[PDB]
Amino acid sequence: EMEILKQKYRLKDLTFLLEKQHELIKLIIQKMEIISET
Amino acid sequence: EMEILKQKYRLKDLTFLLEKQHELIKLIIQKMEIISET
Amino acid sequence: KSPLHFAASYGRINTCQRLLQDISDTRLLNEGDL
């Protein structure tokens, strides 16, 4: 039981780290200029 | 059983969030100009 | 050559069309990689 429970806290931290990554990856699209691709 | 089942829905949501991230990361490559690297 | 292999590999639209302004150029259009 504690083996899966330790895996849950590592996965819940993982998906939380994926939120800040995805939100920041939204931010590069929000602030990046483009000329050639128009 | 419900401990793993709760972990499945969090993982299935995780890989779904990774799809929209990867598709959007495909989009920055599709629309980004380059001059120096040619 | 190498840019059009790159630019088509990643869907960069307007890169291809200016590379395909050279009409009747089929040899590099169907050129192969190593």
UniProtKB/Swiss-Prot annotation, chains A, B:
Q: Where in the cell is it found?
A: Cell membrane
Residues noted as binding a 1,2-diacyl-sn-glycero-3-phospho-(1D-myo-inositol) in the record, renumbered to the chain: K6, Q7, K8, Y9, R10, L11, K12
Q: How is it modified after translation?
A: TRPA1 activation by electrophiles occurs though covalent modification of specific cysteine residues in the N-terminal cytoplasmic domain.
Coiled-coil annotated residue ranges, if any: 2-31
Q: How does it assemble?
A: Homotetramer. Interacts with TMEM100. Interacts with EGLN1. Interacts with the scorpion wasabi receptor toxin at the same site that electrophiles but in a non-covalent manner.
Q: Which family does it belong to?
A: Belongs to the transient receptor (TC 1.A.4) family.
Q: What does this protein do?
A: Ligand-activated Ca(2+)-permeable, nonselective cation channel involved in pain detection and possibly also in cold perception, oxygen concentration perception, cough, itch, and inner ear function. Has a relatively high Ca(2+) selectivity, with a preference for divalent over monovalent cations (Ca(2+) > Ba(2+) > Mg(2+) > NH4(+) > Li(+) > K(+)), the influx of cation into the cytoplasm leads to membrane depolarization. Has a central role in the pain response to endogenous inflammatory mediators, such as bradykinin and to a diverse array of irritants.
Q: What disease does the Swiss-Prot or TrEMBL record associate with this chain?
A: Episodic pain syndrome, familial, 1: An autosomal dominant neurologic disorder characterized by onset in infancy of episodic debilitating upper body pain triggered by fasting, cold, and physical stress. The period of intense pain is accompanied by breathing difficulties, tachycardia, sweating, generalized pallor, peribuccal cyanosis, and stiffness of the abdominal wall. Affected individuals do not manifest altered pain sensitivity outside the episodes.
Q: What is known of its domains?
A: C-terminal helices from the four subunits associate to form atypical coiled coil structure; this region is probably involved in binding the inositol polyphosphates that are required for optimal channel activity (in vitro).
Write down what this protein is called: Transient receptor potential cation channel subfamily A member 1
Q: Per the UniProt entry, what species is this protein from, by scientific name?
A: Homo sapiens
- The gene for this chain is TRPA1
